[PDB]
């Protein structure tokens, strides 16, 4: 009932902004794939990948070093769809806002997001 | 067995050579109160807050932008939560990984996100 207030939105903002461009409908598109993925898991494997940078950076500035870089190396395998999630959030946070593409990709894709995002928290 | 025992003894001669502070703990202390966040909710927060920066950016450059714009707030007041995991990732993520209080603290916070990131597992 608010949906059709918002249909009337998109498309009189898409005339004015003159089929269409996708954006987000292929990050919908990979979404119940990643039922299993939590948060918790997330920030873990961020605090792993900085572990496996830091242990390089100190290399290059050892049976230590070696051993825990081998294990980090070893656990990340255990976190590869988490890793995914983390560069999908990096890929949509690096979009230009400015352009004509992906405001048009945006503008079609709006009504998928929300009505996914108000699914989402019923 | 004698695995952590290996791990535990990398950190320790690894820490002779780098002569406590702490970095990842705090994450650590916050990681059960995110027992409900989702990375399906993490990734459509992305969304919304892009839709959010988006119709504003296009404002500057209108009934139906102001209308689209409330609905996102509006429903983003569901999403707090996902939004402060989003903050804390990019926070953790920036951390001057060639600095010796992070390195320090570091060093210190390895074994317990270790532990925590091998039982997300087991």
Redesign the interface.
């Given at each position: 009932s608010?949906m059709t207030?918002?249909e009337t939105?998109?498309h009189?903002?898409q005339e004015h902004?003159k089929v269409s461009k996708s954006v987000?409908v292929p990050?919908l598109n990979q979404?119940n794939s990643?039922?299993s993925?939590?948060?918790?898991?997330?920030?873990?494997?961020?605090?792993?990948?900085?572990?496996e940078?830091?242990f390089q950076?100190?290399k290059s500035e050892?049976?230590?070093?070696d051993?825990?870089m081998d294990?980090?190396k070893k656990?990340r395998g255990?976190?590869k769809e988490?890793h995914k999630?983390?560069k999908?959030?990096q890929e949509?946070?690096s979009?230009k806002?400015?352009n004509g593409t992906?405001?048009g990709g945006?503008l079609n894709d709006?009504l998928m997001?929300?009505d996914?995002?108000?699914t989402?928290?019923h």
């Open positions: 608010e207030h918002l939105n998109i009189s903002l902004y987000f990050h979404l990643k039922a993925c939590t948060c918790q898991a997330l920030l873990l494997e961020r605090m792993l990948n900085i572990y940078e830091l950076d100190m050892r049976k230590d070093l051993h825990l294990e980090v656990l255990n976190y988490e999630v983390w999908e959030l949509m946070n979009v806002v400015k992906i405001r945006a709006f997001v929300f996914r995002a108000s989402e928290k």
